[PDB]
Amino acid sequence: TKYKGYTLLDKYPKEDDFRDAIYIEDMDNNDTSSVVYCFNVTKATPTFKGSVVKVLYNEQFGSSKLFTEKAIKPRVKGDELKNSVLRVIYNGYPSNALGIKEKYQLTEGQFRKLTQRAVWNFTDSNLSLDKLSQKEIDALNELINAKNAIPDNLVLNLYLPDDSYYQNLLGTKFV
């Protein structure tokens, strides 16, 4: 089963400052699209949904070995990385385990943007506060610093592209 990755550049309003909403969709139909996040800030996002270029991906169970091999400047390695990232997805958009969205009155788009940035904090040692208001900065700090308990069962898929010019993508549906 191949997957296609793509962006919806017009999904969120201008005020969210967030065009790169990435989705993954299987090539065989029955199922629908799923939110994913870019795992590599220095690589290219997939093309837009209407693009003539379709960027193709393979699905893999994300392990410690694998998250570490695919992260480019990871802030931490092994299990500490797997856990940090699983926790970001669990607390971030759309899961929202801590109620961070409602605590800082974020729009869906802002929350997703912040989740993307938190992922990058761990995978690329890159925390960008660029163009964020104070409440966005506070939410983003709560996200990367949270040390809450997560279920033991959790696994996410990593989507690996045919062409390594493009980012690896991290799923948000726990298996």
Side-chain angles (χ1 to χ4, degrees), residues 6 8 22-26 31-36 49:
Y6 60 76
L8 289 175
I22 313 169
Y23 290 80
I24 205 85
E25 180 170 341
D26 76 272
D31 214 319
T32 203
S33 259
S34 168
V35 174
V36 301
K49 191 183 174 182

Side-chain angles (χ1 to χ4, degrees), residues 33-45:
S33 259
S34 168
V35 174
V36 301
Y37 292 109
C38 177
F39 202 74
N40 309 110
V41 80
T42 60
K43 293 278 154 96
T45 59

Side-chain angles (χ1 to χ4, degrees), residues 143-146 148-152 154-157:
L143 209 42
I144 69 150
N145 287 312
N148 58 314
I150 54 186
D152 303 340
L154 271 29
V155 162
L156 291 176
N157 290 313

Side-chain angles (χ1 to χ4, degrees), residues 5-55:
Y6 60 76
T7 49
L8 289 175
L9 298 174
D10 275 349
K11 169 160 174 119
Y12 290 112
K14 159 190 92 80
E15 291 79 7
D16 286 342
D17 191 37
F18 186 62
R19 297 181 176 172
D20 289 345
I22 313 169
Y23 290 80
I24 205 85
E25 180 170 341
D26 76 272
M27 291 298 76
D28 296 342
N29 301 303
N30 279 304
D31 214 319
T32 203
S33 259
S34 168
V35 174
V36 301
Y37 292 109
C38 177
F39 202 74
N40 309 110
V41 80
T42 60
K43 293 278 154 96
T45 59
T47 45
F48 170 54
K49 191 183 174 182
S51 172
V52 291
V53 174
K54 302 297 172 202
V55 180

Side-chain angles (χ1 to χ4, degrees), residues 83-106 111 115 118 122 138-146 148-151 154 174:
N83 291 342
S84 298
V85 167
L86 290 176
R87 180 181 287 111
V88 167
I89 274 64
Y90 185 68
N91 295 333
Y93 176 82
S95 187
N96 198 22
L98 290 175
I100 284 164
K101 187 192 189 294
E102 297 74 28
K103 187 183 176 179
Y104 300 87
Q105 292 161 106
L106 300 179
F111 190 32
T115 305
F122 294 105
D138 293 345
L140 175 56
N141 283 322
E142 194 150 338
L143 209 42
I144 69 150
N145 287 312
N148 58 314
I150 54 186
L154 271 29
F174 299 103

